[PDB]
Nucleic acid binder design. Sequence first.
RNA 1: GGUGAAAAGAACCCCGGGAGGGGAGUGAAAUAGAGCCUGAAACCGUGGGCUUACAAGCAGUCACGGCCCCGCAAGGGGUUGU
RNA 2: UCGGGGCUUAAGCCCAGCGCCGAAGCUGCGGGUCUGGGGGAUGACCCCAGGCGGUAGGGGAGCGUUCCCGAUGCCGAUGAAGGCCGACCCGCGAGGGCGGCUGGAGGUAAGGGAAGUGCGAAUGCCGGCAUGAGUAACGAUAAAGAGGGUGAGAAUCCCUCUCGC
RNA 3: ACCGGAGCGCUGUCUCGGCGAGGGACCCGGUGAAAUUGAACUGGCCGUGAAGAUGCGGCCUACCCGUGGCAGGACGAAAAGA
RNA 4: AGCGGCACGCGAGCUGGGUUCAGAACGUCGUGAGACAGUUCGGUCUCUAUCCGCCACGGGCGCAGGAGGCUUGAGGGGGGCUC
Lengths: 117, 137, 151, 112, 52
Amino acid sequence: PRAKTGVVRRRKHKKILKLAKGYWGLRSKSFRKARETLFAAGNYAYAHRKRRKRDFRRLWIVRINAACRQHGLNYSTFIHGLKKAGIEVDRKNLADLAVREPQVFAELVERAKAAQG
Amino acid sequence: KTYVPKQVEPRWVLIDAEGKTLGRLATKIATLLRGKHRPDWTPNVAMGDFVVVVNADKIRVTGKKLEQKIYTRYSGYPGGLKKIPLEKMLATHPERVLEHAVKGMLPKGPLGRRLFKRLKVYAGPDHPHQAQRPEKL
Amino acid sequence: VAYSGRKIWPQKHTGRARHGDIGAPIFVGGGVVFGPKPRDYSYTLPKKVRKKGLAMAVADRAREGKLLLVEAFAGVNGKTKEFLAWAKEAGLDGSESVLLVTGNELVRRAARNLPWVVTLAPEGLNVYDIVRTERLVMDLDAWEVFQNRIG
Amino acid sequence: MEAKAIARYVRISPRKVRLVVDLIRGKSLEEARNILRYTNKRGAYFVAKVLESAAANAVNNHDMLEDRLYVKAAYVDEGPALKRVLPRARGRADIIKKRTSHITVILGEKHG
Amino acid sequence: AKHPVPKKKTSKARRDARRSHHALTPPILVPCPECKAMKPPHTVCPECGYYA
RNA sequence: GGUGAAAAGAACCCCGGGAGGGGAGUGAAAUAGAGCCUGAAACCGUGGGCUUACAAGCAGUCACGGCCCCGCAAGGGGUUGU
RNA sequence: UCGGGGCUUAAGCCCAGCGCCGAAGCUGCGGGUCUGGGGGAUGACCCCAGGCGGUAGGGGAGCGUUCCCGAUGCCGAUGAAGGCCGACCCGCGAGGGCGGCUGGAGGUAAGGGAAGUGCGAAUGCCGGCAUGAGUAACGAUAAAGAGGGUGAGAAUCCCUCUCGC
RNA sequence: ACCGGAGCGCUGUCUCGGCGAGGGACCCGGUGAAAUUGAACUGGCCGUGAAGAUGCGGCCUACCCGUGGCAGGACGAAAAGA
RNA sequence: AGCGGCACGCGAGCUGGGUUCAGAACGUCGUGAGACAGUUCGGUCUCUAUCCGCCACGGGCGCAGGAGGCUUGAGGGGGGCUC
Ligand SMILES: [Mg+2]
Ligand SMILES: [Mg+2]
Ligand SMILES: [Mg+2]
Ligand SMILES: [Mg+2]
Ligand SMILES: [Mg+2]
Ligand SMILES: [Mg+2]
Ligand SMILES: [Mg+2]
Ligand SMILES: [Mg+2]
Ligand SMILES: [Mg+2]
Ligand SMILES: [Mg+2]
Ligand SMILES: [Mg+2]
Ligand SMILES: [Mg+2]
Ligand SMILES: [Mg+2]
Ligand SMILES: [Mg+2]
Ligand SMILES: [Mg+2]
Ligand SMILES: [Mg+2]
Ligand SMILES: [Mg+2]
Ligand SMILES: [Mg+2]
Ligand SMILES: [Mg+2]
Ligand SMILES: [Mg+2]
Ligand SMILES: [Mg+2]
Ligand SMILES: [Mg+2]
Ligand SMILES: [Mg+2]
Ligand SMILES: [Mg+2]
Ligand SMILES: [Mg+2]
Ligand SMILES: [Mg+2]
Ligand SMILES: [Mg+2]
Ligand SMILES: [Mg+2]
Ligand SMILES: [Mg+2]
Ligand SMILES: [Mg+2]
Ligand SMILES: [Mg+2]
Ligand SMILES: [Mg+2]
Ligand SMILES: [Mg+2]
Ligand SMILES: [Mg+2]
Ligand SMILES: [Mg+2]
Ligand SMILES: [Mg+2]
Ligand SMILES: [Mg+2]
Ligand SMILES: [Mg+2]
Ligand SMILES: [Mg+2]
Ligand SMILES: [Mg+2]
Ligand SMILES: [Mg+2]
Ligand SMILES: [Mg+2]
Ligand SMILES: [Mg+2]
Ligand SMILES: [Mg+2]
Ligand SMILES: [Mg+2]
Ligand SMILES: [Mg+2]
Ligand SMILES: [Mg+2]
Ligand SMILES: [Mg+2]
Ligand SMILES: [Mg+2]
Ligand SMILES: [Mg+2]
Ligand SMILES: [Mg+2]
Ligand SMILES: [Mg+2]
Ligand SMILES: [Mg+2]
Ligand SMILES: [Mg+2]
Ligand SMILES: [Mg+2]
Ligand SMILES: [Mg+2]
Ligand SMILES: [Mg+2]
Ligand SMILES: [Mg+2]
Ligand SMILES: [Mg+2]
Ligand SMILES: [Mg+2]
Ligand SMILES: [Mg+2]
Ligand SMILES: [Mg+2]
Ligand SMILES: [Mg+2]
Ligand SMILES: [Mg+2]
Ligand SMILES: [Mg+2]
Ligand SMILES: [Mg+2]
Ligand SMILES: [Mg+2]
Ligand SMILES: [Mg+2]
Ligand SMILES: [Mg+2]
Ligand SMILES: [Mg+2]
Ligand SMILES: [Mg+2]
Ligand SMILES: [Mg+2]
Ligand SMILES: [Mg+2]
Ligand SMILES: [Mg+2]
Ligand SMILES: [Mg+2]
Ligand SMILES: [Mg+2]
Ligand SMILES: [Mg+2]
Ligand SMILES: [Mg+2]
Ligand SMILES: [Mg+2]
Ligand SMILES: [Mg+2]
Ligand SMILES: [Mg+2]
Ligand SMILES: [Mg+2]
Ligand SMILES: [Mg+2]
Ligand SMILES: [Mg+2]
Ligand SMILES: [Mg+2]
Ligand SMILES: [Mg+2]
Ligand SMILES: [Mg+2]
Ligand SMILES: [Mg+2]
Ligand SMILES: [Mg+2]
Ligand SMILES: [Mg+2]
Ligand SMILES: [Mg+2]
Ligand SMILES: [Mg+2]
Ligand SMILES: [Mg+2]
Ligand SMILES: [Mg+2]
Ligand SMILES: [Mg+2]
Ligand SMILES: [Mg+2]
Ligand SMILES: [Mg+2]
Ligand SMILES: [Mg+2]
Ligand SMILES: [Mg+2]
Ligand SMILES: [Mg+2]
Ligand SMILES: [Mg+2]
Ligand SMILES: [Mg+2]
Ligand SMILES: [Mg+2]
Ligand SMILES: [Mg+2]
Ligand SMILES: [Mg+2]
Ligand SMILES: [Mg+2]
Ligand SMILES: [Mg+2]
Ligand SMILES: [Mg+2]
Ligand SMILES: [Mg+2]
Ligand SMILES: [Mg+2]
Ligand SMILES: [Mg+2]
Ligand SMILES: [Mg+2]
Ligand SMILES: [Mg+2]
Ligand SMILES: [Mg+2]
Ligand SMILES: [Mg+2]
Ligand SMILES: [Mg+2]
Ligand SMILES: [Mg+2]
Ligand SMILES: [Mg+2]
Ligand SMILES: [Mg+2]
Ligand SMILES: [Mg+2]
Ligand SMILES: [Mg+2]
Ligand SMILES: [Mg+2]
Ligand SMILES: [Mg+2]
Ligand SMILES: [Mg+2]
Ligand SMILES: [Mg+2]
Ligand SMILES: [Mg+2]
Ligand SMILES: [Mg+2]
Ligand SMILES: [Mg+2]
Ligand SMILES: [Mg+2]
Ligand SMILES: [Mg+2]
Ligand SMILES: [Mg+2]
Ligand SMILES: [Mg+2]
Ligand SMILES: [Mg+2]
Ligand SMILES: [Mg+2]
Ligand SMILES: [Mg+2]
Ligand SMILES: [Mg+2]
Ligand SMILES: [Mg+2]
Ligand SMILES: [Mg+2]
Ligand SMILES: [Mg+2]
Ligand SMILES: [Mg+2]
Ligand SMILES: [Mg+2]
Ligand SMILES: [Mg+2]
Ligand SMILES: [Mg+2]
Ligand SMILES: [Mg+2]
Ligand SMILES: [Mg+2]
Ligand SMILES: [Mg+2]
Ligand SMILES: [Mg+2]
Ligand SMILES: [Mg+2]
Ligand SMILES: [Mg+2]
Ligand SMILES: [Mg+2]
Ligand SMILES: [Mg+2]
Ligand SMILES: [Mg+2]
Ligand SMILES: [Mg+2]
Ligand SMILES: [Mg+2]
Ligand SMILES: [Mg+2]
Ligand SMILES: [Mg+2]
Ligand SMILES: [Mg+2]
Ligand SMILES: [Mg+2]
Ligand SMILES: [Mg+2]
Ligand SMILES: [Mg+2]
Ligand SMILES: [Mg+2]
Ligand SMILES: [Mg+2]
Ligand SMILES: [Mg+2]
Ligand SMILES: [Mg+2]
Ligand SMILES: [Mg+2]
Ligand SMILES: [Mg+2]
Ligand SMILES: [Mg+2]
Ligand SMILES: [Mg+2]
Ligand SMILES: [Mg+2]
Ligand SMILES: [Mg+2]
Ligand SMILES: [Mg+2]
Ligand SMILES: [Mg+2]
Ligand SMILES: [Mg+2]
Ligand SMILES: [Mg+2]
Ligand SMILES: [Mg+2]
Ligand SMILES: [Mg+2]
Ligand SMILES: [Mg+2]
Ligand SMILES: [Mg+2]
Ligand SMILES: [Mg+2]
Ligand SMILES: [Mg+2]
Ligand SMILES: [Mg+2]
Ligand SMILES: [Mg+2]
Ligand SMILES: [Mg+2]
Ligand SMILES: [Mg+2]
Ligand SMILES: [Mg+2]
Ligand SMILES: [Mg+2]
Ligand SMILES: [Mg+2]
Ligand SMILES: [Mg+2]
Ligand SMILES: [Mg+2]
Ligand SMILES: [Mg+2]
Ligand SMILES: [Mg+2]
Ligand SMILES: [Mg+2]
Ligand SMILES: [Mg+2]
Ligand SMILES: [Mg+2]
Ligand SMILES: [Mg+2]
Ligand SMILES: [Mg+2]
Ligand SMILES: [Mg+2]
Ligand SMILES: [Mg+2]
Ligand SMILES: [Mg+2]
Ligand SMILES: [Mg+2]
Ligand SMILES: [Mg+2]
Ligand SMILES: [Mg+2]
Ligand SMILES: [Mg+2]
Ligand SMILES: [Mg+2]
Ligand SMILES: [Mg+2]
Ligand SMILES: [Mg+2]
Ligand SMILES: [Mg+2]
Ligand SMILES: [Mg+2]
Ligand SMILES: [Mg+2]
Ligand SMILES: [Mg+2]
Ligand SMILES: [Mg+2]
Ligand SMILES: [Mg+2]
Ligand SMILES: [Mg+2]
């Protein structure tokens, strides 16, 4: 029994080509170029996925530190007060309170300045 | 999901330069050029205050510096490397020395330039008395 | 393959690839690599196993209750319509596939053209045919033959 | 409505005639006849040929008003190329494609 | 062939961009006084003639 | 190597020197029109949406934002500015 | 040019202290798979602890292609195969399915059998089509010009005159 | 029409280049190849890295697209190093 | 009448005298075929530049109303000899 190639190759190809729609030039037209690009893409995503967290942690910090700065103290000491005052609550994300509901951030500042000494 | 600010208004600031240590001042100037002090900070927007500097011709700088310390420009041509000491910079256009400091302190991207334009430096005192002249130190 | 052994080109400073002759399997129209040759697929199954199977088939078919020894083939003389009558009055409504084993040549002819019936001489008893069919019907005499081999 | 007309298998390179077509896309039938009337390219003759036929079709087949129709769109497509062998130096030889075109012009009524 | 050769197939983008300035201009024409017809400026044209 | 069940293979009119088309007509289908069944990809082109002329690039990826588009609607698709 | 800007009781060097930042390490929450150990009489299933970077390579479990039995069967013009499209469902994945469009005559469950069974690279083979590019070239530097004619169309065909070899 | 040395005559071989002629190159109309080509959104310096970077780092520079030219680089093309 | 770097800069710029193919000979070594860094005469160097770089020249758009003319000079280049 002879088993020609037939549908098989074309179909596995069209799949990848779908995944590559949108890529520049030959990179979204040539199967061989498409796969290669995808290889890179997949790896990037998985690694940017890891970074994404590490990214926002940073953004938050600056915004927090910005609000702490105008409020007298700095980020370093602010966290310490909070970490000491047992207020593990504020996850550095939810310290977006600095942006909106500042009176609450303010309340949270004295709690930290209190825990200082 | 984290807060994104909308179209806000730039806070025009005014800093007196004379007396201030060159690099030290530039650092703060840079920070103001980005948000980084406003708790709604957003890394991809351009929201830093419009810093205005005056009396830049009177920036202080430790050590020998002025005598030594030299700025180098490079023309494309052979030998095209020019070298100019801090001394002669102030002799002529001096606002340069502060600019070249704040510029080198901004991020190198297309955004970096947008911000570098918000920095207005003058030999001072005096300048475009547009709106806000919020003294700052 | 019917080509010449001639080397297609020099294989040096030609700048082309590197080849021997059109016959080679990397060539289109060339020869096949490990394509099929003619061969014997048969083997010699242990006779004792062949027997057991024949028994277990008949047996399996007997436990189901679909086995049926007969004799009174009143519908002899090769004629389908006649055999139809006989099967009618015998519970073979043609609803179930029947392996009709018998030596009677005329009974054979009759049931033969029926789509639901596989005729068969007693010597031809084989587990395959047995299993293909739902019901098993066989001449008493033929059951003696089956018995001779195993019984 | 709109009136089509196509001349297929025109023995000329597509890239070449295409230069002429783009010259009259959207233009009114009037300035068009003129633009070809005095364009200095071989493609003119062919594009004019199909353009004028498009007109005839438009009126003799779709009651369209001649002095009221323009080039709603037009385009040229590549047909099967004629490959020929060109003897070269040192015995080398190569094929040259005498390409070919499919010129479509589709007219349309002005307004209403 | 001999000596200089292209290092890479020029992209679809590069080719067409080069052909930026390929587009030809339409002829310049003016209506002659004699007929309502069109003619290239500074040129006598058949189906009309000239005022001597 | 392949029109179609059948040649019924497109009369006649129109533009054209012709080729080739547009009407008409045949057929179940003409996107079955004659190298004619299905007709994938590279490749070429027309239209439309998003986008681009101070910007340094394995061409992506993560985020946010704008425009366009599908469910009036909480959603999703395309695009790409940073 | 210390990575740069830039820094001088320092943003340098040394001694001491407190706090913060920070990796895919560790924690939390959810999920997967393997192994061990527990109940489940029970097949199912749940609970607990632990392991899961990987080239050569060994082992295990699957996906799809052609063909055979299942076929005097079943699906098919109320549209088979194949094609194009999807933001939908199922699967860890290879894939499977559904919907829309095209297509127009075949297809082959469950369960098993047999192989010409899966391609991205071999300066691979065959075919198609691109790039260089409207580029080089149009093949002897003996040479042409004009009028008239023919024709859908003429520098290039015919005729006449003039010039040249 | 062998290889070495010298001298006379004469000269763009040269000091040292200039002008002119024709045939190409250039522009328009007609026809229209090739080797090469992982894909390209393809800059400089100083470093770095398999020790010789458009692709890594830092810094500098740079509006988008071409046409005629030059040949330093793409360890340029060609030939699975003679 | 400087020395050195730049693939002892530079052959997709040229040359090809030297070196390092096949011819031939002297000396020389080898029975020999041949050989030597010992010499000697002869000996085919590839029309088309895609990208970067470079010399020049344009098209596009930009410069918050549009246009004509005259300009400022940031930045860059040339020049710098000597008896
Ligand atoms: Mg295969
Ligand atoms: Mg493309
Ligand atoms: Mg494509
Ligand atoms: Mg954190
Ligand atoms: Mg600071
Ligand atoms: Mg500076
Ligand atoms: Mg930044
Ligand atoms: Mg950087
Ligand atoms: Mg820059
Ligand atoms: Mg033969
Ligand atoms: Mg043979
Ligand atoms: Mg033979
Ligand atoms: Mg052979
Ligand atoms: Mg042989
Ligand atoms: Mg041989
Ligand atoms: Mg042969
Ligand atoms: Mg060889
Ligand atoms: Mg090759
Ligand atoms: Mg080969
Ligand atoms: Mg071979
Ligand atoms: Mg061959
Ligand atoms: Mg064969
Ligand atoms: Mg054959
Ligand atoms: Mg065997
Ligand atoms: Mg025995
Ligand atoms: Mg009988
Ligand atoms: Mg009968
Ligand atoms: Mg009968
Ligand atoms: Mg039968
Ligand atoms: Mg039979
Ligand atoms: Mg039967
Ligand atoms: Mg029989
Ligand atoms: Mg039988
Ligand atoms: Mg034709
Ligand atoms: Mg257009
Ligand atoms: Mg024509
Ligand atoms: Mg008509
Ligand atoms: Mg009609
Ligand atoms: Mg076109
Ligand atoms: Mg073709
Ligand atoms: Mg030739
Ligand atoms: Mg040749
Ligand atoms: Mg060739
Ligand atoms: Mg070609
Ligand atoms: Mg394009
Ligand atoms: Mg295009
Ligand atoms: Mg027939
Ligand atoms: Mg016929
Ligand atoms: Mg017709
Ligand atoms: Mg008509
Ligand atoms: Mg007619
Ligand atoms: Mg003709
Ligand atoms: Mg016709
Ligand atoms: Mg009609
Ligand atoms: Mg019709
Ligand atoms: Mg169709
Ligand atoms: Mg359609
Ligand atoms: Mg025919
Ligand atoms: Mg035919
Ligand atoms: Mg045809
Ligand atoms: Mg198609
Ligand atoms: Mg087709
Ligand atoms: Mg296609
Ligand atoms: Mg396309
Ligand atoms: Mg398109
Ligand atoms: Mg388009
Ligand atoms: Mg739309
Ligand atoms: Mg600038
Ligand atoms: Mg990369
Ligand atoms: Mg978003
Ligand atoms: Mg958004
Ligand atoms: Mg809006
Ligand atoms: Mg709208
Ligand atoms: Mg979206
Ligand atoms: Mg992006
Ligand atoms: Mg430093
Ligand atoms: Mg800095
Ligand atoms: Mg200092
Ligand atoms: Mg000590
Ligand atoms: Mg001590
Ligand atoms: Mg101590
Ligand atoms: Mg200690
Ligand atoms: Mg501590
Ligand atoms: Mg910490
Ligand atoms: Mg860190
Ligand atoms: Mg992890
Ligand atoms: Mg974790
Ligand atoms: Mg877990
Ligand atoms: Mg678990
Ligand atoms: Mg797993
Ligand atoms: Mg394990
Ligand atoms: Mg277990
Ligand atoms: Mg346990
Ligand atoms: Mg158990
Ligand atoms: Mg159980
Ligand atoms: Mg129990
Ligand atoms: Mg058990
Ligand atoms: Mg676990
Ligand atoms: Mg690993
Ligand atoms: Mg299988
Ligand atoms: Mg297969
Ligand atoms: Mg088959
Ligand atoms: Mg069947
Ligand atoms: Mg039958
Ligand atoms: Mg169906
Ligand atoms: Mg029907
Ligand atoms: Mg259907
Ligand atoms: Mg249908
Ligand atoms: Mg289908
Ligand atoms: Mg298609
Ligand atoms: Mg849906
Ligand atoms: Mg579903
Ligand atoms: Mg599964
Ligand atoms: Mg599984
Ligand atoms: Mg799927
Ligand atoms: Mg499927
Ligand atoms: Mg699917
Ligand atoms: Mg249909
Ligand atoms: Mg079957
Ligand atoms: Mg199974
Ligand atoms: Mg099966
Ligand atoms: Mg199987
Ligand atoms: Mg199977
Ligand atoms: Mg199975
Ligand atoms: Mg099997
Ligand atoms: Mg095979
Ligand atoms: Mg392969
Ligand atoms: Mg073929
Ligand atoms: Mg073919
Ligand atoms: Mg061929
Ligand atoms: Mg090929
Ligand atoms: Mg192609
Ligand atoms: Mg081509
Ligand atoms: Mg080609
Ligand atoms: Mg081309
Ligand atoms: Mg041209
Ligand atoms: Mg030429
Ligand atoms: Mg010619
Ligand atoms: Mg020639
Ligand atoms: Mg003449
Ligand atoms: Mg006459
Ligand atoms: Mg005449
Ligand atoms: Mg005519
Ligand atoms: Mg003609
Ligand atoms: Mg004549
Ligand atoms: Mg001629
Ligand atoms: Mg002689
Ligand atoms: Mg002599
Ligand atoms: Mg002599
Ligand atoms: Mg004398
Ligand atoms: Mg004498
Ligand atoms: Mg002499
Ligand atoms: Mg001179
Ligand atoms: Mg002269
Ligand atoms: Mg000349
Ligand atoms: Mg010229
Ligand atoms: Mg030309
Ligand atoms: Mg870009
Ligand atoms: Mg670019
Ligand atoms: Mg250095
Ligand atoms: Mg490195
Ligand atoms: Mg080096
Ligand atoms: Mg380097
Ligand atoms: Mg890196
Ligand atoms: Mg770099
Ligand atoms: Mg640079
Ligand atoms: Mg130009
Ligand atoms: Mg040109
Ligand atoms: Mg150029
Ligand atoms: Mg070069
Ligand atoms: Mg001397
Ligand atoms: Mg000396
Ligand atoms: Mg030297
Ligand atoms: Mg030197
Ligand atoms: Mg060196
Ligand atoms: Mg050296
Ligand atoms: Mg050396
Ligand atoms: Mg030297
Ligand atoms: Mg040496
Ligand atoms: Mg040299
Ligand atoms: Mg050379
Ligand atoms: Mg040399
Ligand atoms: Mg060379
Ligand atoms: Mg010599
Ligand atoms: Mg030497
Ligand atoms: Mg040599
Ligand atoms: Mg020799
Ligand atoms: Mg010796
Ligand atoms: Mg010896
Ligand atoms: Mg010796
Ligand atoms: Mg010696
Ligand atoms: Mg020696
Ligand atoms: Mg000597
Ligand atoms: Mg000698
Ligand atoms: Mg000679
Ligand atoms: Mg020599
Ligand atoms: Mg010679
Ligand atoms: Mg010579
Ligand atoms: Mg020669
Ligand atoms: Mg050659
Ligand atoms: Mg030549
Ligand atoms: Mg070029
Ligand atoms: Mg390049
Ligand atoms: Mg280039
Ligand atoms: Mg350049
Ligand atoms: Mg320009
Ligand atoms: Mg310009
Ligand atoms: Mg003006
Ligand atoms: Mg004036
Ligand atoms: Mg003027
Ligand atoms: Mg100046
Ligand atoms: Mg000068
Ligand atoms: Mg100078």
